[PDB]
């Protein structure tokens, strides 16, 4: 059936009886009243049972061996479903598939019942998840620490072509993968004031909120290692939080609101108090847990030798001043020793350069909520600027530019500057992004401490993003080069010698056609629409953002439609362009773009002259589980952000690994992907970072493009006149206005080159054999983009630990 | 070891391995890091496993056989712990005791870890729990329906002698006994308005709250029957309940607050909207569930033949108009047919006659929250008063007295009148209470429909209240008459022939001494105080209420103290008087009484001259699990409410069954207990109902008693001068003031007779042999107070079903 493992006679028999055991004793059901959800839960428990043993020994192991521990702090962990992932990493997939078959059930149908653990917004959150998988597969003693939101990313509904947000009550039916641990409940403080007494400062009269941990197992790939992802949940103390007795009890929900919902912002900062509370909550509980574990393993001199804390963006940046608070105020270490320790254990990862995404917290907020932390930040700033003054005497302007405190309307703390000053390493997520950080945004810091700056190009895990979602492709690859590539993706290079293999070429093309047929069916099954599986599947799925330019894609789609209407009887390569992604609730322009996409589809999809040559479909509720479905079925991957705006991107790597060709700009990781596959095997177009700068010096004037490109002007006039919105002719006035007068992302500037490039893609598609051979050269060179490579680099160049592919002593 | 069942070799082996299975797979622990709470949970799951099979077949059975179903609606179910109770009813106690012993654990230590399911205030709530146990033991197809409060009765803490309330977060570590069933989630409506259209009225524009059920198994005593207690939990819909996206999500907690906390009022009405919402919530979800089940089993003519709904007090009274709403508005039945059906399926139980406990809801509240129900209530009232007018022509005053609508300051709906009009049966809970209902409070209704009024004297379950909490006494009883009495308490009469048995007399006295020694140890273990186990254990435990007169007990205690101080070297029977119970948070006088008790103990307990002859101890956090501890250790049970105020009482029956003698007034069930044991074997005193009336006609003047009783006057002057409150001399001015000028319960009127009676109790105690022989005559005649008797009466005289002690076909 496939290398989903073996289906042993004894193993299948054991699984079946345990499945029946859980259906009965755990779910209290019998075959006569059990629903598919019951069946899913019986299977989940049966599979979960196989982790317990490994989980206990792995943790037991780390206790005995006492290795250096890696702590990955993130406010997001975009996990998705975990049933299939667990079976894969445990080699149980075929056995469970057989067992359920014999019990008369369809395992695939059961898998669709699991809810996605959508505790993330997009790229940043999914990177943390891929990293967790790689760290376990590489035998690192790593822990993922975050917040257990009871409501993750909202479920997206399209109503009248508009996005509607609906609460993601993912825990409604229960989460079999988490393990509550009330024995490690910790107190977190807020507000209060600072008292300066004889022997040190004291933070008093604070409001207490308890942090209760929930542990989720993270299994490595077939090595018997099971690490932990610890998510904190807010719980109110039962005393004080006890005017009215009834009210006092109902009011407990005020403290517990801290972990209620994930902020739905992607690459956008919103300075709300609740968000700051969430950030301190996760930091305060995590560091107590880290130090407690360390004390078991009081000279904190060896702290950095046993502890590494990785900050995923600046969200958990309060870890720096919190570590100082604990070491100086509680452990009574002298400032300088505490600072040496802090810098040596902390490392920071930057994920974007757009200004609106940078965390700049108003000082009055930190003053009220965390008074002691504000004082420590001021002291850190003081000493840091003294260092700068010494290094660049008289450079008064550099002084204000590098300050962690920004003066102006309202004073603010620049969390990124805080992170650079208190970390021994700072990294970008793609070569171009890391260079841009040194050359622009953090130039002053790089000049001060060049040794701190590094790069760690992102990656994705080949387990979920290949074996799990595309078993067919994984099978034909393994048939030729073996299975060793699953945890050593570089071996994919060996596929280069099959580029002329008539058999391989036919197989690769076959799995893609099967994936497209399956997705096409899913589209009609759960969404009822109908699409032609013979057309080119053009897809752009990611969060809706002006910088990602779903709008540039829209212009091309309209261009295609207009060319068809001009010469109806001319042949054109049929296309099914699918765009999907969620817009943050308060992001007006992004919501306007979603409406534009659905409006274009309303016209195009019902034009008889167009026929089945062009279909515009908006993919509803894009999330991890849906990505696993569309990506393997894609032919063309759209990665068209304005050069210099997408730090790295990861969806791009997912598409490359699954047999889709890429059309994109020289941005983020796109640059390194083309470098690995060869630019001849990539569809690159548009301005490079340098051209964008040149245009900015000159001054970007959209009118110029509108004046010189008839096809462009026709589109804009179609939008303004109401051609795509009959009942509301001026519906899209905002978009047209932005495009013409305030386009920070120069959509028009890349239009001509994009359309031309798209023409070249259509020409290659007309030649199946050659299209497929290029795909093979992409798949064969995607090895570098595995998160196992990324993690091995973080491990060796930042954390100071050696990865290991050694199987743990059985379960 | 005892008739806790057999400890089979195979059974103990099986239990041990399953215990280890759960500790590993369920709790993810190993013997090296498992805490006692883990051990408790492993045992709970092991025992719980033995119910699943029985639960499924019992429910399966009721489906096939299709008997008439009994639905017991209550806003309270005071369950207590359930581990030991489950082992008893399953005959697993000795086997589990052996198994844990061999695993090196103490089962008793593990049992103390379980949290009490305190979803009740006192008597009314505990009656529902005893009833559930009896209904299962009697093979009735019964379902208990209520609300799953996440916070039950508050935990009581004494600070500075004052009561402090603390949230009862009983679900913090999880509840292994409940089973969530999201597949039966039902919608409940609130607010909205009524539209009158062509074919009927419509309730529109309502706010929807979802009701999710949680099922808890209720095992019968060793008959393999397992019934269900279904508790509803409030859940917000994820759409509309989705101004701000974040706010919308945080605001879900407004709808879910409905099931957040139990109102801590005992025999007291508080007309708060949240409470009304809770009442409709449980009624609306329950009736949908009832009708759905009925439709499976559309002529609602047979509805009453298959359905019986028992209303525990007026709390679920909205069931009457809700049943009408559904039948008339949705099922489209004609009014009269719907009314015939409603009356025939509904029955109401009254639990008190004090006016402040009567539910009288303001019309403006029902108008806003349940507009359609208000209309139906008006129509019910209309037709009912027409009936009255026809029966008593011209009796205009009877008309207003019987109205369900009370005019005045604010119009109100008398929920009790609603219940009488819409039920085919109305019952009191003790013979005297039922007579008082007919003679006073509901006299007009009794004259209209005499056939409706009945009595069903309360009872307690002998499983929890004898076998579970007093195995020693249960063992010596069984040694002589067998085990059949456990489900046939009347057989206890056979013990009468052992009243002169020298061996029995010595045994009965022995178990009491052991129980007292054990409790005395527990007191020092968890509360550190020290008490003399040789003294007479004088206890009054129940909710603090003026009508229960903990104050009368206080006066006696002070009298004793004063007599000792007067003649220090005179001998007196040593006593340890223990008073315990919670005061509703807003009940000022009750909280003042708790402070009085602790203040008396502060003086008495530290007076050297008193020595160990008198100790006054206030029992902290009285609840079901504590009752199971004190009751078996008591010698004297205080049931001293003012004649005519305690409807029945049940604590009194618990004490009688466990070998304590009773000192009390001719009130509630006390009357029938003395009647069963013989007044010579009871310590009765004080005014009878008739004497209280006589005093009221005359006019109660406390000053008279103060003027004629020197000992009384001395006490009152001690309270006024600050003798019991040095730092705050006027601390108890409120109590003295009430006692002298506004004592609704005539404490002073029963003082003299009470003290004299107490002297007689002390004299009998001085004669161990005779004290014990009287105890035997009480225990031997307590058979009538088993809830199995009560339930068999409800079954035969109200519900129309026959109980059965037939074992269900194995598990
Ligand atoms: O709670 C039980 N089983 C779990 C089995 C289970 C466990 C985890 C999960 F994610 C889904 C189902 C369950 O259904 N839920 C707990 C977690 C969540 O709140 C949903 C309800 C349970 C079984 C059972 C048997 C008896 Cl006899 C009595 C009470 C019981 N409860
Ligand atoms: O949740 C698990 N077990 C239950 C075992 C259990 C079930 C009911 C109960 F009342 C107490 C304990 C539990 O500890 N809780 C669920 C209910 C409550 O929220 C407390 C935490 C669990 C075991 C386990 C093993 C693995 Cl390998 C992964 C996740 C897991 N979760
Ligand atoms: C991989 C992934 C992303 C990141 O996509 P980019 O195109 O890099 O922005 C976002 N969302 C989901 C659901 C993903 O799987
Ligand atoms: C039995 C019981 C009651 C009822 O006691 P009364 O003396 O009848 O008021 C109250 N609380 C608890 C904990 C009980 O067990
Ligand atoms: O680093 C992980 C991801 O973080 C953010 O989502 C960036 O916008 C994206 O470019 C990057 O791939
Ligand atoms: O009916 C059960 C109980 O209800 C209330 O608590 C009454 O006050 C009490 O007298 C009675 O025993």
**Helix-, strand-, coil-residue percentages of chain A, each rounded to 5:** 55, 15, 30
> Resolution limit in angstroms?
1.8
In Å, how far is A35's CA from the nearest CA of chain B?
A: 9
- How far apart CA A50 and CA A87 sit, in angstroms, is 9
Cα–Cα distance measured from residue A561 to residue A610, given in angstroms and rounded to the nearest whole number: 8
Nearest Cα to Cα of residue B335 among B296, B382, B402, B294: B382
Of B130, B542, B581, the one to substitute when testing ligand 4's pocket (max ligand atoms within 8 A of C-beta) is B542
Find residues 103-142 of chain A whose CB sits inside 8 Å of chain B.
none
Give the integer Cα–Cα distance in Å for B598 and B596: 6
CB B804 within 8 A of CB B138: yes
Closest CA to B75 of B293, B249, B377, B277: B277
Helices (H) and strands (E) in chain B, counts: 31, 25
Neighbours of B718 (CB within 10 A): 18
Ligand 5 atom 12: the closest Cα is on which residue? A649
Asked if B25 lies within 8 A of A52 by C-beta distance, the reply is yes
Distance in angstroms (rounded) separating the CA atoms of residues A129 and A229: 10
Q: Give the C-alpha distances (Å, rounded to integers) separating A543 from A270, A467, A532, A582, B725.
A: 17, 25, 26, 5, 70
By CB atoms closer than 10 A (0-12, 13-18, 19+), residue A727 is exposed
Cβ-contact A416, A359 below 8 angstroms = yes
Q: Which of A314, A650, A662, A665 is catalytic?
A: A650
Note the residue count of chain B: 811
**B26, B246, B258: which to substitute to probe chain A, counting the most A Cβ within 10 Å?**
B246
**CB-CB neighbours of A382 under 10 Å:** 11
CA B438, B439, B441, B442 torsion-angle sign: positive
End-to-end Cα spacing for chain B: 26
How far apart are the C-alpha atoms of A431 and B774, rounded to whole Å?
Answer: 94
Question: What is the rounded distance in angstroms from the CA atom of residue B593 to the CA atom of residue B553?
Answer: 11
CB B628 within 8 A of CB B605: no
Q: Are B172 and A179 inside 8 Å of each other by CB? A: no
Cβ contact A41:A28 at 8 Å: no
DSSP code at position B509: H
Nearest CA among B736, B476, B472 for reference residue B592: B736
Residue A627 in contact with residue A541, Cβ under 8 Å? yes
Indicate if ligand 3 lies below 6 Å from the C-beta of A118.
Answer: no
Can you tell me the distance from the alpha carbon of A665 to that of A688, in angstroms, rounded to the nearest whole number?
7
Any A CB within 8 A of B250 CB: yes
Q: Are A284 and A189 in contact (CB under 8 A)?
A: yes
DSSP 8-state class, residue A794:
H
**Closest-lying ligand to the alpha carbon of A459?**
5
DSSP-derived letter for residue A522 is H
CA distances from A807 to A62, A64, A330, A804, B94 (A): 14, 17, 41, 9, 45
A260/B250 Cβ within 8 A: yes
For chain B, the helix, strand and coil percentages under 3-state DSSP, each to the nearest 5:
55, 15, 30
Q: Between chains, do B257 and A264 touch, taking CB under 8 Å as contact?
A: no
Task: Answer yes or no: do B166 and A28 touch at CB < 8 A.
Answer: no
- State the CB neighbour count (10 A cutoff) for residue B441: 18
A35: left (phi over 0), alpha (psi -120 to 50) or beta: beta
Which candidate, B37, B583, B615, B385, places its Cα nearest to that of A184?
B37
CA atoms in the 13 A half-sphere facing the CB of B439: 10
3-state secondary structure of B331: coil
Residue nearest to atom 9 of ligand 5 (CA): A649
Q: Tell me the C-alpha distance between B478 and B489, whole Å.
A: 12
Q: CB–CB of A173 and B182 under 8 A?
A: yes
Find, among A338, A342, A341, the residue nearest to A329 by Cα.
Answer: A338
CA of residue A110 relative to chain centroid, distance = 26
Give domain B1-459+787-809's CATH superfamily. Glycogen Phosphorylase B; (3.40.50.2000)
Q: Coil, strand or helix: which one is A69?
A: strand
Report the alpha-carbon distance of residue A349 to residue B754 in Å, rounded. 80
Contact B250 A272 (CB under 8 A): no
Per DSSP, what are the bridge partners of residue B579? B540, B618
Judged by DSSP in three states, B488 sits in coil
A430 and A457 in contact (C-beta within 8 Å)? yes
CA A289 to each of CA A136, A227, A486, A799, B683: distance values in angstroms, whole numbers, following the listed order: 20, 16, 34, 19, 61
**Residue A648 alpha carbon to ligand 5 centre in Å:** 6
Q: Which ligand has the shortest distance to the CA of A152? A: 3
DSSP single-letter state for residue B154? P
Q: For ligand 3, is residue A668 a contact (CB within 6 Å)?
A: no
Sequence-ordered list of residues with C-beta below 8 angstroms from that of A35, at least 6 positions apart, any chain: B183
Is B29 annotated in the active site? no
Backbone angles phi, psi at B162, to 5 degrees: -105, 150
Q: How far is CA B322 from CA B196, B291, B377, in A?
A: 18, 12, 10
Looking at the CA of B429, name the nearest ligand: 6
Which 175-194 residues of chain B touch chain A by CB within 8 A?
179-180, 182-183
As a whole number of angstroms, the distance between CA B700 and CA B149 comes to 43
Which strand (E) or helix (H) includes residue B552?
A: helix B550-566
- B543 is known as an active-site residue: yes
Closest Cα to residue B125, out of B160, B168, B76? B76
Closest listed residue to residue B320, CA positions, set B445, B423, B417, B232 = B423
DSSP A535-593: SEEEEEES---GGGTHHHHHHHHHHHHHHHHHSTTS----EEEEEE----TT-HHHHHH
The yes-or-no answer on residue A286 being catalytic is no
Helix A733-741, helix A588-604: angle, nearest 10: 110
- A362 to chain B, any CB pair closer than 8 A? The answer is no
Ligand 5 centroid vs B545 CA: distance in angstroms? Answer: 65
Sign of the Cα torsion A293, A296, A301, A304 reads negative
Residues 6+ apart with CB under 8 A from A804: A138, A139
Q: Which residues contact A525 (CB under 8 A, 6 or more apart)?
A: none
Which of A166, A248, A250 is nearest residue B238 as measured by Cβ atoms? A166
Please count the CA atoms within 13 angstroms of the CA of A108 that sit on its side-chain side: 6
CB contact under 8 A, A261 and B246: yes
Using CA atoms, how far apart are residues B730 and B707, in angstroms rounded to an integer?
22
Please give the distance, rounded to the nearest whole angstrom, from the Cα atom of residue B507 to the centre of ligand 6: 33
- From A651, A654, A640, select the one nearest A683 (Cα to Cα): A640
Q: Which of B28, B183, B253 is nearest residue A35 as measured by Cβ atoms?
A: B183
Domain assignments of chain B as residue spans, ordered by start: 1-459+787-809, 460-786
Dist. CA B797–CA B153, nearest whole Å: 33
Taking the Cβ of residue A273 and every Cβ of chain B, the question of whether any pair is shorter than 8 Å is answered with: no
Q: Is A123 in the pocket of ligand 5 (CB under 6 A)?
A: yes
Asked whether A694 and A749 are in contact (CB, 8 A), the reply is: no
Q: Do domains B1-459+787-809 and B460-786 have the same CATH topology?
A: yes
The CA distance from B691 to the nearest CA of chain A, in Å, is 39
> CB count, 10 Å around CB of A484?
11
For A645-674, b/e burial (b = at least 16 CB within 10 A) is: bbbbbbbbbbbbbbbbbbbbbbbbbbbbbb
Give the integer Cα–Cα distance in Å for A621 and A343.
41
How was it solved? X-ray
As for ligand 1, residues whose beta carbon falls within 6 Å of it are A 26-28, 41, 173-176; B 48, 51-52, 55, 177-180, 217
Strand B193-196 vs strand B155-159: parallel, antiparallel, or unpaired?
unpaired
Q: Which residues of B touch A590 (CB under 8 A)?
A: none
In sequence order, the β-bridge partners of residue B156 are: B165
Exactly one of B277, B516, B542, B575 is catalytic; name it.
B542
| Buried/exposed A509-541: b ≥16 CB within 10 Å, e otherwise | bebbeebbeebbeebeeeeeeebbbebbbbbbb
Question: To the nearest whole angstrom, how far is the Cα of A97 from the nearest Cα of chain B?
Answer: 22
Rounded Cα distance, A613 and A605, in Å: 10
Closest to A365 in 3D by CA, of A241, A276, A262? A276
Q: How far is the CA of B44 from the centre of ligand 1 (A)?
A: 13
Bridge-based pairing of strands A226-235 and B661-664 is unpaired
Q: How far is the C-alpha of B232 from the C-alpha of B213, rounded, in Å? A: 5
Fold classification of A460-786 (topology level): Rossmann fold (3.40.50)
Ligand-binding site membership of A295 (annotated): yes
- For residue A58, the ligand closest to its alpha carbon is 2
Q: Residue A82 has what DSSP assignment?
A: -
Contacts of B25 in chain A (CB under 8 A): 49, 52
Please list the alpha-helical segments (H only) found in A307-421: 319-325, 335-345, 363-369, 371-391, 396-402, 415-421
Which helix (H) or strand (E) segment is B11 a member of? Answer: helix B9-21
> Are the C-beta atoms of residues A468 and A625 closer than 8 Å to each other?
no
Whole-angstrom distance, CA of residue B205 vs CA of residue B178: 34
What is the spatial distance between Cα A78 and Cα A121, in angstroms, rounded to a whole number? Answer: 7
Q: Do residues B630 and B619 make contact, with C-beta atoms less than 8 angstroms apart?
A: yes
A35 touches chain B (CB under 8 A): yes
- How many Å apart are CA B528 and CA B793, to the nearest integer? 46
Residue A564: CA count within 13 A, CB half-sphere: 22
Closest among B737, B639, B628, B736 to B686, alpha carbons compared: B639
CA–CA distance, A121 with A584 (Å, rounded to integer): 9
- Write out the DSSP string of A278-319: HHHHHHHHHHHHHHHHHHH---GGGHHHHEEEEEESSTTTTH
Say if CB B689 and CB B666 are below 8 A apart: yes
Burial class (CB in 10 A: 0-12, 13-18, 19+), B741: exposed
Structural element, H or E, at residue A157: strand A155-159
Across the beta sheet with A405-406, the strand order is: A360-362, A412-414, A405-406
Going by C-beta distance under 8 Å and a sequence separation of 6 or more, which residues neighbour residue A377? Answer: A321, A366, A404, A405, A413, A418
Tell me whether B167 touches chain A (CB under 8 Å).
Answer: yes
What angle, 0 to 180 degrees and rounded to 10, lies between the N-to-C axes of helices B9-21 and B36-65? 110
B31 Cα to the center of ligand 1, angstroms = 24
Q: A245 to chain B: which residues are within 8 Å by CB?
A: 154, 165, 264, 585-586
């Amino acid at each position: 059936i496939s290398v989903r493992g073996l289906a042993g006679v004894e193993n299948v028999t054991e699984l079946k009886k345990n499945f029946n055991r859980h259906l009965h004793f755990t779910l209290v059901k019998d075959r006569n009243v059990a629903t598919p959800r019951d069946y899913y839960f019986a299977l989940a428990h049966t599979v979960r049972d196989h982790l317990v043993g490994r989980w206990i020994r792995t943790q037991q192991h780390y206790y005995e061996k006492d290795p250096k521990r890696i702590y990955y702090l993130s406010l997001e962990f975009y996990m998705g479903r975990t049933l299939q992932n667990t079976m894969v990493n445990l080699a149980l997939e075929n056995a469970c598939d057989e067992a359920t078959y014999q019990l008369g059930l369809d395992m695939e149908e059961l898998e669709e019942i699991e809810e996605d653990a959508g505790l993330g917004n997009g790229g940043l959150g999914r990177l943390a998840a891929c990293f967790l998988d790689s760290m376990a597969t590489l035998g690192l003693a790593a822990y993922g620490y975050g917040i257990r939101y009871e409501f993750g990313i909202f479920n997206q509904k399209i109503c009248g072509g508009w996005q509607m947000e609906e609460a993601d009550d993912w825990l409604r039916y229960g989460n079999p993968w988490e393990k509550a641990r009330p024995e490690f409940t910790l107190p977190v403080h807020f507000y209060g004031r600072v008292e300066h007494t004889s022997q040190g400062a004291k933070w008093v009269d604070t409001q207490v909120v308890l942090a209760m941990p929930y542990d989720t197992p993270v299994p490595g790939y077939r090595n018997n290692v099971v690490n932990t992802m610890r998510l904190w949940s807010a719980k109110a103390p039962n005393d004080f939080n006890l005017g009215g007795y009834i009210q006092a009890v109902l009011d407990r929900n005020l403290a517990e609101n801290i972990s209620r919902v994930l902020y739905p912002n992607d690459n956008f900062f919103e300075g709300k108090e609740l968000r700051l509370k969430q950030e301190y909550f996760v930091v305060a509980a995590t560091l107590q847990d880290i130090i407690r574990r360390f004390k078991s393993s009081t000279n904190f001199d060896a702290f950095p030798d046993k502890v590494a804390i990785q900050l995923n963006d600046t969200h958990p940046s309060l870890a720096i001043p919190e570590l100082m608070r604990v070491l100086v105020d509680l452990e009574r270490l002298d400032w300088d020793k505490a600072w040496e320790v802090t810098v040596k254990t902390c490392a920071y990862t930057n994920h974007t350069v757009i200004p609106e995404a940078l965390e700049r917290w108003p000082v009055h907020l930190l003053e009220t909520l965390l008074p002691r932390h504000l004082q420590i930040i001021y002291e850190i700033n003081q000493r840091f600027l003294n260092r700068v003054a010494a290094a660049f005497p008289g450079d008064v302007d550099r002084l204000r530019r590098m300050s962690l405190v920004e003066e102006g309307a309202v004073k603010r703390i620049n969390m990124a500057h805080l992170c650079i000053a208190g970390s021994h390493a700072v990294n970008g997520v793609a070569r171009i992004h890391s260079e841009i950080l040194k050359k622009t945004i953090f130039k002053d810091f790089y000049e001060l401490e060049p040794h701190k700056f590094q790069n760690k190009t992102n990656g994705i895990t080949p387990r979920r993003w290949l074996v799990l979602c595309n078993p067919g492709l994984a099978e034909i690859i393994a048939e030729r080069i073996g299975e060793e590539y699953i945890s050593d993706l570089d071996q994919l290079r060996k596929l280069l010698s099959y580029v002329d293999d008539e058999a391989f070429i036919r197989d690769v093309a076959k799995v893609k056609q099967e994936n497209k047929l399956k997705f096409a069916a899913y589209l009609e099954r759960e969404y009822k629409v109908h699409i032609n599986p013979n057309s080119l599947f053009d897809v752009q799925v990611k969060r809706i953002h002006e910088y990602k330019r779903q709008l540039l894609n829209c212009l091309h789609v309209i261009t295609l439609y207009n060319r068809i209407k001009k010469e109806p009887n001319k042949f054109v390569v049929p296309r099914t362009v699918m765009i999907g992604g969620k817009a943050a609730p308060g992001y007006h322009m992004a919501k306007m773009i979603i409406k534009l996409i659905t409006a274009i589809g309303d016209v195009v999809n019902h034009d008889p002259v167009v026929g089945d040559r062009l279909r515009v479909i908006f993919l509803e509720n894009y999330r991890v589980s849906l990505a696993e479905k569309v990506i393997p079925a894609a032919d063309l991957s759209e990665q068209i952000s304005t050069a210099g705006t997408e730090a790295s991107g990861t969806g791009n790597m997912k598409f490359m690994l699954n047999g889709a060709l890429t059309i994109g700009t020289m941005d983020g990781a796109n640059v390194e992907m083309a470098e690995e596959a060869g630019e001849e095997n990539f569809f690159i177009f548009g301005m490079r970072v340098e051209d964008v700068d040149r245009l900015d010096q000159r001054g970007y004037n959209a009118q110029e493009y509108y004046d010189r490109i008839p096809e462009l002007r026709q589109i804009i006039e179609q939008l303004s006149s109401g051609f795509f919105s009959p009942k509301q002719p001026d519906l899209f006035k905002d978009i047209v206005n932005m495009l013409m007068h305030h386009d920070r992302f120069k959509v028009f500037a890349d239009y001509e080159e994009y359309v031309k490039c798209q023409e070249r893609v259509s020409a290659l598609y007309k030649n199946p054999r050659e299209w497929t051979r290029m795909v093979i050269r992409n798949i064969a060179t995607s090895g570098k983009f595995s998160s196992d490579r990324t993690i091995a680099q973080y491990a060796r160049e930042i954390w100071g630990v050696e990865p290991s592919r050694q199987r743990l002593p059985a379960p």
